[PDB]
Amino acid sequence: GPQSFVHFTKQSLALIEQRIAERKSKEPKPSSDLEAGKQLPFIYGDIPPGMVSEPLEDLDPYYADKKTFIVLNKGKTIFRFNATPALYMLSPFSPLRRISIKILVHSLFSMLIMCTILTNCIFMTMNNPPDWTKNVEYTFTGIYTFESLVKILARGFCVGEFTFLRDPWNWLDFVVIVFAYLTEFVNVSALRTFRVLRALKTISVIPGLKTIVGALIQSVKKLSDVMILTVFCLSVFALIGLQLFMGNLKHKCFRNSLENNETLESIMNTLESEEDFRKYFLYLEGSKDALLCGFSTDSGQCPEGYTCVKIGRNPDYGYTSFDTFSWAFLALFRLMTQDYWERLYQQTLRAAGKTYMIFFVVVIFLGSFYLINLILAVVAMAYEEQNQANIEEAKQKELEFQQPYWIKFKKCIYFIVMDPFVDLAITICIVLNTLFMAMEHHPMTEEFKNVLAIGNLVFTGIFAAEMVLKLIAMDPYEYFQVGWNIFDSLIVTLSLVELFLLSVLRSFRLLRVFKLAKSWPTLNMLIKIIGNSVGALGNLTLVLAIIVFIFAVVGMQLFGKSYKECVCKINDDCTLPRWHMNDFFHSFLIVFRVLCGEWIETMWDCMEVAGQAMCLIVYMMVMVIGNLVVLNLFLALLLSSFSSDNDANNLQIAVTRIKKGINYVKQTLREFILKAFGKIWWNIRKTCYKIVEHSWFESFIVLMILLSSGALAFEDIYIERKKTIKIILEYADKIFTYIFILEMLLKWIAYGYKTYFTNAWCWLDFLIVDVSLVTLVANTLGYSDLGPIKSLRTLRALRPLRALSRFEGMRVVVNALIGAIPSIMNVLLVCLIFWLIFSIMGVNLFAGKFYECINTTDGSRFPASQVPNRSECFALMNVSQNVRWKNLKVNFDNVGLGYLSLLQVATFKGWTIIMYAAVDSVNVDKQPKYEYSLYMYIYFVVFIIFGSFFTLNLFIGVIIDNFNQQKKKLGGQDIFMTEEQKKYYNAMKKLGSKKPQKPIPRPGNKIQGCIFDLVTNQAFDISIMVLICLNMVTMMVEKEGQSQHMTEVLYWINVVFIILFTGECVLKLISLRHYYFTVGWNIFDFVVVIISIVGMFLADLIETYFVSPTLFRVIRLARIGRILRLVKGAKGIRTLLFALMMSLPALFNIGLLLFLVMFIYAIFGMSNFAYVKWEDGINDMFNFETFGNSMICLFQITTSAGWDGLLAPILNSKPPDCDPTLPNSNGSRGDCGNPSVGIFYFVSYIIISFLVVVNMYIAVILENFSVA
């Protein structure tokens, strides 16, 4: 009981030695609430005042027998030691031991350690430490020695059982202190790096961090199977890309204009440097890489006079290659993370042909889309079950816990403040303020600036008046009692500080919008999430901040001097690049960018200056650990808040009274106005009704729509030359229109006007036939070349939409997407206003500053030393012709352009040139300077954290809640599966969960008996598995440029492997006696061995009978079938692959709809952008001139990769960039682009594709939760 409090005495020590004597004469877990480091049970009451900081005997009966004693704080936390003297000298009663306990057992000691640690972290971030910091370093070493020595004196070193080194966290202290004195007593980067380990001590000293890091480790522990699958899949696809693309990125066009007997070999002998490479090969302007080339008809066709020859290095400094298995693995990992993969995709297609788009499609679907889903689902399950355990433990803990003139003036003015009118007036003024500050733009006249300024003066007037009036209406002591009032006070007093006599300060007016949270339910949820970011979940956010700090400082210490000294090898003018790790801030930015998803481009430079190894380990550590922590935080916010939600408001009072008033006047004026004052037709009906419902009509009509939609794809820029096909297409178009008109008439007659017109699908078909009629009559009358009718032409691209109602897959998927529109619209409004705040802030900061004065020959901004003003560039234009004062196309000149720039930043596409213009901006009409505004990166960091991370978190939560609501409103069935797919899906459930088959019969024949016993055993299976892994290795051994001897060797080893696997299959045939074919995996074995032999014969036929290397490489892929068999044994890999097989139907439906959307946008893009100028992505190979070339671009940007590069040439609309009078083969003129259609096209596309792929994400992840 509570009485069990007694001092630790030497008499008690005698008692201890004697009862341990008893236990030794004759010769239980520790309590879950009595272990050290937490709070003592409340049943024992409070401590005697003479007992704090004094040794006590252990309360646990299990620990009452061994050597131990407990010590308490004033904070009443418990620490336990062992009774054995420290190192066998310091008895627990010496002066040293209890002074060490007193110092160690204290809150002030821990606080001192925390402050000195954080000061040390502040001192780590010094690029060039001043010489005087040595003494400060010695000081820190002194405090760390003091704290260590206190721990040894209080606990011993290792002699006992509970002592200094027993817990792992003290090992870090020991290592750092011994390494500090090692460097003190005795590759400066190597020594200076290991001091970052003290930054890890915050995890030990700040409370709660221990459990957070333990939780992260436990979450990792579950990723074993998924990491094995990831390695397996990346290796298999790396071998596939090895076989297909080995050496193609070596192709370069070579100038045939070489004279004086210099042939290809005569130059081969002398190609070692890069200057001679630039002398003889083709380098597109502004590129460090030689332009690729190919041999197929669909590859990169070299210019005239250039021959395409595979010589020289691979692109990107050598690092983009599918030559050796390591480089292929790097490429497939860059494809799985979709990091700048839209450049590898373009190079691979340019050098190998547009026909490996299928390779990239299957890699993107399987590599990126699926493995990431698996990772997210497993981490989510880990966190969810851990959270359930925590909640259940907390609940159990709760159950155990339970078991004169001024006064009348003030009250009258307070009455002037009534909830209905004052609050709504203030809300309206807030909304008008935000809509009034949104009228700022760069080209502005004094009139409009003046009205803006006076309006802002008025609004700050009303808000200050409100603040003073609520100051005096209710006592200032009580004004501050609520958070909203103090928030508003801070806003007002800061706006007055503005009115005293800064650009960032101009915009904190915008925060008063958030006061709308009380009325608006969904904005309040964003407030809740941002609050959890620092509230219930502040420890995890603090872990994340600490890790980003440590990675930044580690990378800086390792690579700063490397970046500085080897600067000339990553930049041509021999100055530091834009992204570097020379400073703490720039290394922080690189770490942040890697956390955003951008890691290949900076690692190329890292490895250029600091060598491959360290760069790879450090970058992959950052990737894995940082992405782990960020994903954990995101999932925690999501689950916590959307399971959290799982006096009347002042606006509600206003609605009440205003409804009272409006209803009162409405019905009283209502009272005022009352007081002041045929068998044949229905035969046709039935016959048509069975006609339209008859199956052949439906199938014919679906075929008809498919044919019209397909005919849409031929009208490309080569339809003039195809004389025959043109006539067929136009005649067919007429027939299609007539058929659909007849279909509409038949359905009209058969169903009736109301029935046909109460259905939305018929509304779609009706609008389409209407526009076809319009264009038909306009063609007949002769007004074909009128512009509006020429535009109604392009609307023929909407024809594929007729298919949505005929196939049930996109019908059900569209039903779900439509059921989700309201919630999507609420979230979109919240995001719209949030990004509106950020867009007005960006317009205040940057509007009109992105202008610059350039050499148009190379695009080089002039030095700001000369030509620093706009007038200076105009003078230069006057004196030198080819000079331009150009602005960025996507900029912050107004709130629309601000929202386009924010959309580019939030998806990290095009965002870099935006930030370079931001940080280099000086002021309006002044030329930008290199990182003049260096700390404007923080605007983008804050926008990415808030408008991107948190809004996406809110969107995901609302979508998940909406989809589970739909699933419950359907009774618990699936929402992307038709009836037949549900039936199949249940069937494949039954197949997968099959009870094991009965044991195979035992053959009677004796030699059959021996072979059967041999083959049917574990050892045979393990032997085959080891052989398959060995064959995998001998496949990875292949490289590019290998000598013929190694080729023959690997050929023979592969032959041997085919021999042994054929032997295994033959012994299986003989021993199981056609029962081989019963078990499913043996059919796969059979197919693998057959295709292995057939491919091995066919290839050797190819190099001797029909010599074509491409077909050779395609058939030689049958080797890869052998590798597939490793999934035979792994019980987790199968489960995951069976999850994929389970989820395939829903993905088929969603991908069908996505494909139809891509088809529609491809027809539109061919109609509109087929003649835009070739700039920044639109080139000879990647354009909208053909259906293939359009759908290639649309697949590229279905992942939103590089859409900023396709949109850029369309934004050209004027003669300085584009050219509006240029003869074209369509009959039109100009290679120009109109921005409005381009912006609508790309923004819409990325939004619809985002919605659809998020739907795929939800389907797959819920499938994984269901199966597991």
Ligand SMILES: COCC(CCO[C@H]1CC[C@@]2(C)C(=CC[C@H]3[C@@H]4C[C@@H]5O[C@]6(CC[C@@H](C)CO6)[C@@H](C)[C@@H]5[C@@]4(C)CC[C@@H]32)C1)COC
């Ligand atoms: C407390 O008990 C709750 C239980 C119901 C549990 O339902 C779960 C269904 C799976 C689901 C929706 C849940 C939590 C984490 C969710 C994952 C977090 C990741 O977030 C994402 C999207 C957002 C990205 C930023 C990160 O990845 C998804 C890929 C991943 C995710 C959305 C896949 C789906 C997961 C809730 C009922 O108990 C009675």
Ligand SMILES: CC(C)CCC[C@@H](C)[C@H]1CC[C@H]2[C@@H]3CC=C4C[C@@H](OC(=O)CCC(=O)O)CC[C@]4(C)[C@H]3CC[C@]12C
């Ligand atoms: C739902 C919320 C988040 C947005 C509501 C729409 C408006 C409040 C915003 C969005 C687009 C903004 C407009 C973007 C473009 C312009 C053009 C601008 O005038 C010019 O650029 C003239 C240029 C010239 O004369 O050369 C004036 C501000 C204005 C109207 C902005 C006013 C504020 C607008 C209309």
Ligand SMILES: CC(C)CCC[C@@H](C)[C@H]1CC[C@H]2[C@@H]3CC=C4C[C@@H](OC(=O)CCC(=O)O)CC[C@]4(C)[C@H]3CC[C@]12C
């Ligand atoms: C904030 C600045 C940039 C002006 C932007 C426009 C807003 C004033 C509009 C857009 C969204 C509208 C809100 C949409 C949703 C709501 C919630 C509505 O109340 C509920 O929905 C209660 C639901 C429930 O209790 O379950 C009150 C109106 C309100 C705040 C609307 C108020 C007017 C809003 C905020």
Ligand SMILES: CC(C)CCC[C@@H](C)[C@H]1CC[C@H]2[C@@H]3CC=C4C[C@@H](OC(=O)CCC(=O)O)CC[C@]4(C)[C@H]3CC[C@]12C
């Ligand atoms: C010709 C161009 C210039 C303008 C075209 C405008 C139409 C696209 C608008 C006007 C009437 C609207 C329709 C009004 C009625 C309906 C029925 C509605 O379905 C129902 O109401 C079902 C009700 C039920 O089942 O109980 C679906 C939307 C729809 C097709 C609307 C779709 C959009 C329509 C066709």
Ligand SMILES: *[C@@H]1O[C@H](CO)[C@@H](O[C@@H]2O[C@H](CO)[C@@H](O)[C@H](O)[C@H]2NC(C)=O)[C@H](O)[C@H]1NC(C)=O
């Ligand atoms: C803009 O750049 C171009 C090319 O970079 C300059 O034109 C020539 O540049 C070369 C450098 O390789 C000089 O040797 C020539 O003398 C330049 N020719 C002329 C006519 O200038 C051009 O000078 C640059 N513009 C300005 C204003 O300096």
Ligand SMILES: *[C@@H]1O[C@H](CO)[C@@H](O[C@@H]2O[C@H](CO)[C@@H](O)[C@H](O)[C@H]2NC(C)=O)[C@H](O)[C@H]1NC(C)=O
């Ligand atoms: C912007 O242009 C120049 C760029 O330095 C500014 O400086 C003037 O330059 C002219 C021509 O070199 C000199 O004659 C003047 O003496 C410079 N000004 C001064 C104060 O020395 C010029 O002032 C700027 N003009 C505007 C309108 O901003």
Ligand SMILES: *[C@@H]1O[C@H](CO)[C@@H](O)[C@H](O)[C@H]1NC(C)=O
């Ligand atoms: C071949 O190259 C040599 C250079 O040593 C040159 O003298 C000779 O004329 C060349 N032959 C022809 C046919 O151009």
Ligand code: NA
């Ligand atoms: Na990159």
